Structures are given as C-alpha cells and as structure tokens.
Amino acid sequence: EPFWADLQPRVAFVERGGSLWLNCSTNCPRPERGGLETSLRRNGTQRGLRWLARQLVDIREPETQPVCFFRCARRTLQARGLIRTFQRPDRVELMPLPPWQPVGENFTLSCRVPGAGPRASLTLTLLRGAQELIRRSFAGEPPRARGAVLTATVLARREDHGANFSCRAELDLRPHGLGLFENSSAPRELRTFSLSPDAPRLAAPRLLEVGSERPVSCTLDGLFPASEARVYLALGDQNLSPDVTLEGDAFVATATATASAEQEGARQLVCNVTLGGENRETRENVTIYSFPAPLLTLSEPSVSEGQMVTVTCAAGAQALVTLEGVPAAVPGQPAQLQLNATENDDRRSFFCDATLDVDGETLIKNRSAELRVLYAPR
Ligand SMILES: *[C@@H]1O[C@H](CO)[C@@H](O[C@@H]2O[C@H](CO)[C@@H](O[C@@H]3O[C@H](CO)[C@@H](O)[C@H](O[C@H]4O[C@H](CO)[C@@H](O)[C@H](O)[C@@H]4O)[C@@H]3O)[C@H](O)[C@H]2NC(C)=O)[C@H](O)[C@H]1NC(C)=O
Ligand SMILES: *[C@@H]1O[C@H](CO)[C@@H](O[C@@H]2O[C@H](CO)[C@@H](O)[C@H](O)[C@H]2NC(C)=O)[C@H](O)[C@H]1NC(C)=O
Ligand SMILES: *[C@@H]1O[C@H](CO)[C@@H](O[C@@H]2O[C@H](CO)[C@@H](O)[C@H](O)[C@H]2NC(C)=O)[C@H](O)[C@H]1NC(C)=O
Ligand SMILES: *[C@@H]1O[C@H](CO)[C@@H](O[C@@H]2O[C@H](CO)[C@@H](O)[C@H](O)[C@H]2NC(C)=O)[C@H](O)[C@H]1NC(C)=O
Ligand SMILES: *[C@@H]1O[C@H](CO)[C@@H](O)[C@H](O)[C@H]1NC(C)=O
Ligand SMILES: *[C@@H]1O[C@H](CO)[C@@H](O)[C@H](O)[C@H]1NC(C)=O
Ligand SMILES: *[C@@H]1O[C@H](CO)[C@@H](O)[C@H](O)[C@H]1NC(C)=O
Ligand SMILES: *[C@@H]1O[C@H](CO)[C@@H](O)[C@H](O)[C@H]1NC(C)=O
Ligand SMILES: *[C@@H]1O[C@H](CO)[C@@H](O)[C@H](O)[C@H]1NC(C)=O
C-alpha cells in the first residue's frame, strides 16, 4: 500500500469548445499540498479533504494532458490524464462536377471534410444515388490529425445523365460511448453528352433563284441528349428558322430559303450544332442567280389587216434571246420581228426564249403572246 494520486476521468472526449469536470483524489493521511496542472481555464471548483475538483472550460486543442498532484509526507504524488477534443463533420463538400462531361470519359469526384476529428475515426464515402462508389476508412492516422479527403475517378455513362453524386462523412465515437456523427454534402447532378465526330448532313440545291422557294434540310445522328443540342441554319447572312424535330438520338432540321438579292453567285449554306461545349459544322457552296423574265411586247395587240406590227422580246442584260426560232441579232439585246397584219394572223402566237448560263448550268424561261386581227369589210 503506497500512497497515490488519482485523476478522473483518465481518458476524456469532449466536443471542441466544450467543458468537463476533472476530479483529483488521494489516499495520503494528510496532504501538504494539492492541485491540478493544466493550460486550460476553469470555471467551477469543488474540493474535499482527500479530493479536489475543477471544471475545465472552452477546450479547443486536440490534445492536452492534465496532471493531478498531491503532496503527502514530503513526497509528490501524481496522476496524469488525457483530454481529446472531437469535431463533427460540419463541413462535407463535394467538388463541382464538369458542366458537361463526355460519355466514355473520366471525371474525378473530390470530397473534403475539413476539421472533422479524430481523423482515424472518420469514414468517407462517395455515392452515386444510393449506391456506394468508394468507401474509405482512415484508421491508422495520427491521433492529433483533423480532417479527411476522399477522391475517386468515375467513368461517365449514358446511364449517368441527371444522376446525383454526393459525399458522406462518418465519425465513429462508439468505443467512447458517444455514438456516430455523420453529415452529407449537397448532391451534385451530372450531365453527360455524347457527340459523334461526323459533321451534320446538309441537303440543299446548288442553284437558287432570287424570290424562289426551295426546301433545305440539315441533320445529324448519335446525339445524346438530343434535346439539348442547338442547331443553327442560315443562307449566308439571313437566318433560317428550321423546325428541329427529334427522332431517337437523331435530329432533323427542315426549312425554306428565298434569295433576297443577297448574293447572287457564290454563297454558303451553313449548319452548325452545339451539344455540350462541342460544336460541329457543315457548309455548302450555293449559287444564287437573278434571271429577269423575258418581256414579250406587241406594237399593238389588236390591229386591222394591212397594219404594221412589231413584236419584240426583251430580256435582262444577261441572257440569249430567241424570237420565233430566231436568236437575238445581235446577241445580248432585244430581238425584233416585223410583219404586216393578215387575216391569217388572227389568234397567232409569238414566242420569246431567254437562255441563261449560271455555273455552267443552262436555264430557260419561255414566254408567249397572241395577236388579234380586227375584222372588217374590204
Ligand atoms: C465552297 O467555297 C469555299 C470558298 O467560298 C471553299 O473554301 C476553300 O476551300 C479550299 C480547300 O477546299 C481552301 O484551300 C486552302 O487554301 C489555303 C490558303 O488559304 C491553302 O494553304 C490550303 O492548303 C492546305 O492543304 C494543302 C494540300 O492540299 C497543303 O499543301 C497546305 O499546306 C494546306 O495544308 C487549302 O488548300 C480555300 O482557301 C477555301 N477558300 C476560301 C475563300 O476560304 C470550299 O472549298 C468550297 N466547298 C467545296 C465543297 O468545294
Ligand atoms: C472526487 O473525488 C473522489 C473520487 O472517488 C470522491 O470521493 C468520494 O465520493 C463519494 C461519492 O459517493 C463519497 O461517498 C465518498 O465519501 C468520497 N470520499 C472522500 C474521501 O471524499 C469525490 O466525491 C469526488 N468529487 C466530486 C465533486 O465528484
Ligand atoms: C452538413 O454539411 C453541409 C455542407 O457543408 C453543411 O451545410 C453548410 O452549412 C454552412 C453554414 O452552417 C455553410 O457552408 C452553408 O450554409 C452550407 N453549405 C452547403 C449547403 O453546401 C451543414 O451545416 C452540415 N450539417 C450538419 C451540421 O449536420
Ligand atoms: C454558327 O454559325 C454562326 C453564323 O452567324 C456563327 O456566327 C458568326 O460566325 C462568324 C464567322 O466565323 C464569327 O466571326 C462571328 O463571331 C459569329 N457571329 C455571331 C453573331 O454569331 C457561329 O460562330 C457558328 N457557331 C460556332 C460554334 O462557331
Ligand atoms: C464559465 O464562466 C463564464 C464567464 O467567465 C461563463 O460565461 C460560462 O458560461 C462558464 N462556462 C461554463 C459554464 O462552461
Ligand atoms: C478512367 O480513369 C482512370 C484514372 O485516370 C484512367 O486510368 C482510365 O483510363 C479512365 N478510363 C477511360 C479514359 O476510359
Ligand atoms: C437529384 O437530386 C435532386 C435534389 O437535389 C432531386 O430533386 C432529383 O430528383 C435527383 N435526381 C435523380 C435522378 O434522382
Ligand atoms: C409590209 O408592208 C410595208 C408597207 O408596204 C413594207 O414596207 C414592208 O416591207 C412589208 N413587209 C413587212 C414584213 O413588213
Ligand atoms: C415553257 O412554258 C410552258 C408553259 O408556260 C412550261 O410548261 C414549260 O415547262 C416551259 N418550257 C420549258 C422547256 O421549260
């Protein structure tokens, strides 16, 4: 039976910033001194003959070792305790996901649980929905270590569009009778797009006339999600507003175009799509042309016989003019024909043809007119 000093409790787990009572007791017949050694501030104090009690408050530091001591028979009696603070996982943070992520690519989940301790008792979990992607236990870390970090690389799936990812931190104090403390990050939603290497198909005529209405179509396939893809069509400058319809992962853009005197000649039909951050484009060179209709004119529509009539077919400054089988003489300017009205010329038709070359293409516009020979006696 040696005389001893005792400090209670020996091991203590207090939440950071918290407080606890420490009791020092001794069996020595009379103490010549007594007290408790700590850096911590105290609030309440209690005492007895063989014992002494302090309430230690506002304990921030991960590790502090108090020593309760007594002096009995000119000998120093000692007891050494241990006080360990713990912090709940108040901050659990998942790193921002890529705004758009490629399907078949990899992205990295990063969870961060600052300050939570002790680290050794921490278990971090990365989740996709209710499923656990990875589970990490920190057992074996230093006793004074606070905070934890878990990172994993996940493969993006078409399955994964609109899926929620979260991080889950778990502090296990159960051996100390303090149970479990857990908190989760706000879920992060994942966007997965898939864009095939192919440029969009653009269906257009190579030749377009000013004022004419022709169908134009742009299309693509293998687009996920097809709904989020934004397709732009236009002829040169002017923007077409096609009807974009979605069949499976394929889109179909259908529109109509009229040349405004923008162009004529060399122009581009552009179709560009954006899905995610990626963009595709297809350009078609298109020729526009102005082909003014040939003007067929009679000196008079109605004439008596013997009266002189001049029929002419005039065109724009461009084409080759053919009147009644006779090419314009000379070429490039209106062709004229003259005749004296006969009774046989009543209900007689005249014809003018304009032949224009555009990009090697031969284009014709035919026109007709009818002459009336007024009836009378001779
Ligand atoms: C529709 O019309 C447009 C023009 O309105 C037209 O675009 C042209 O495309 C050709 C190629 O198809 C371009 O030619 C290039 O010209 C550059 C100089 O600017 C050259 O250096 C390029 O040469 C490359 O390839 C060579 C081997 O073939 C290499 O030797 C060289 O190092 C380069 O790698 C290239 O030939 C031309 O510039 C444009 N025109 C304009 C005005 O931008 C387009 O082709 C038409 N579409 C169709 C289907 O015909
Ligand atoms: C701390 O000191 C000792 C720890 O054992 C306590 O001393 C005894 O406390 C019990 C409580 O039921 C009493 O029955 C005994 O008579 C006490 N013994 C003596 C010699 O005092 C003491 O009570 C504790 N003090 C506090 C505030 O917890
Ligand atoms: C669980 O963790 C979340 C995420 O860290 C905590 O929510 C945050 O709370 C603090 C302020 O108290 C701020 O960072 C934000 O207001 C929250 N961040 C968000 C919403 O992303 C939350 O406090 C924790 N829950 C607990 C304590 O159990
Ligand atoms: C899709 O086509 C449009 C046509 O307007 C492009 O818009 C312009 O493109 C020119 C030529 O490259 C650029 O110099 C301009 O900055 C663009 N202007 C405007 C107002 O958009 C557009 O760039 C194309 N889309 C993509 C992704 O390139
Ligand atoms: C200790 O005393 C302070 C005032 O100095 C008081 O505000 C606080 O409540 C006390 N701490 C406790 C009871 O843990
Ligand atoms: C997934 O991520 C791992 C880790 O970087 C990498 O080794 C692997 O190539 C990725 N899978 C792909 C790119 O399909
Ligand atoms: C993802 O989480 C949000 C809440 O943040 C929820 O509204 C949504 O339904 C979830 N998405 C799926 C597909 O579970
Ligand atoms: C028609 O009659 C007029 C007047 O006599 C004459 O000048 C002309 O040569 C005749 N022939 C034609 C085709 O005009
Ligand atoms: C000439 O005009 C007629 C009727 O206006 C039209 O039906 C025909 O297609 C034209 N001829 C040619 C060769 O296009």
Residue numbers in the entry: 1 to 378
Sentences from the paper on this structure:
ICAM-5, initially called telencephalin, is an integral type I transmembrane glycoprotein of ∼150 kDa that is expressed exclusively in telencephalic neurons. It has nine immunoglobulin superfamily (IgSF) domains, with a total of 832 amino acids in the extracellular region, a single transmembrane segment and a 64-residue cytoplasmic domain. In addition to integrin recognition shared with the other ICAMs, ICAM-5 has unique characteristics within the subfamily, as it mediates homophilic adhesion interactions that promote neurite development. The crystal structure of the four most N-terminal glycosylated domains (D1–D4) of ICAM-5 was determined in three different space groups and the D1–D5 fragment was modelled.
In interface B, D1 interacted similarly with D4 in the P21 and R3 crystal structures. Interface B includes positively and negatively charged surfaces in D1 and D4, respectively, and four salt bridges. In the P21 crystal structure, we identified two similar antiparallel arrangements of symmetry-related ICAM-5 molecules with contacts between the N-terminal and C-terminal portions. The head (D1–D2) and tail (D3–D4) of one IC5-4D molecule contacted two distinct symmetry-related partners; each contact buried 500–600 Å2 of surface area and included charged residues in all four interacting domains. In addition, three acidic residues in D3–D4 formed salt bridges with the D1–D2 arginines. The second type of crystal contact buried a smaller surface area (500 Å2) and included no glycans (interface D); a single IC5-4D molecule also interacted with two symmetry-related molecules that buried about 1000 Å2 of its surface. In contrast, in the monoclinic P21 crystals the IC5-4D molecules assemble with an antiparallel orientation and the crystal lattice generates two similar antiparallel trans/trans zippers that resemble the assemblies described for other homophilic cell adhesion structures. This type of zipper could represent of ICAM-5 homophilic cell adhesion complexes. One of the crystal lattices has a molecular assembly that could represent the homophilic ICAM-5 cell adhesion complex in neurons.
